[PDB]
Amino acid sequence: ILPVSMTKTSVDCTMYICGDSTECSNLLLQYGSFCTQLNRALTGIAVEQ
Amino acid sequence: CALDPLSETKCTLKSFTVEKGIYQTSNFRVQPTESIVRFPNITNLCPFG
C-alpha cells in the first residue's frame, strides 16, 4: 500500500480570519502580505497533488 | 484591474502578457438579500379583557 495524494484544499485567509466584517478586513492590510503567502503556499500544494 | 477578467488576471500577477493556464483572480461571496425571519407565536392573549 502506498499513498499518492491527499485531498486538495484551499483557504481564503481574508474571509476565514475576518468574515462578514469589512472593518476587520480593512485592518488586515497592516500585516502586508501574510494572506498572499498563505494562499500561494496552499495553491502550490494543491497543484502538486 | 477592473476592466476585463483578463485585466484582473494580469493585475493578480505583475506581467503585461500571460501564457496558458488558470489562476484564481478573486474570491466571491453571495451577498444575502434584504429579508428577515420571524419569532415564536404568542402563547396567549392580553390579560386585559
From B31, which residue of chain A is nearest by alpha-carbon distance? A20
Q: How far apart are CA B33 and CA A40, in angstroms?
A: 32
State the structure-solving technique: cryo-EM
For B23, nearest residue in chain A (alpha carbons) = A43
Q: What is the resolution of this structure in A?
A: 3.8
Distance, in Å, from the CA atom of A15 to the CA atom of A22, rounded to the nearest integer, reads 10
Distances (CA, A) of A40 to A13, A49, B22, B39: 11, 15, 14, 45
- What does the block give as the cell for A7? 485531498
Alpha-carbon gap: B9 to the closest alpha carbon of chain A (Å): 15
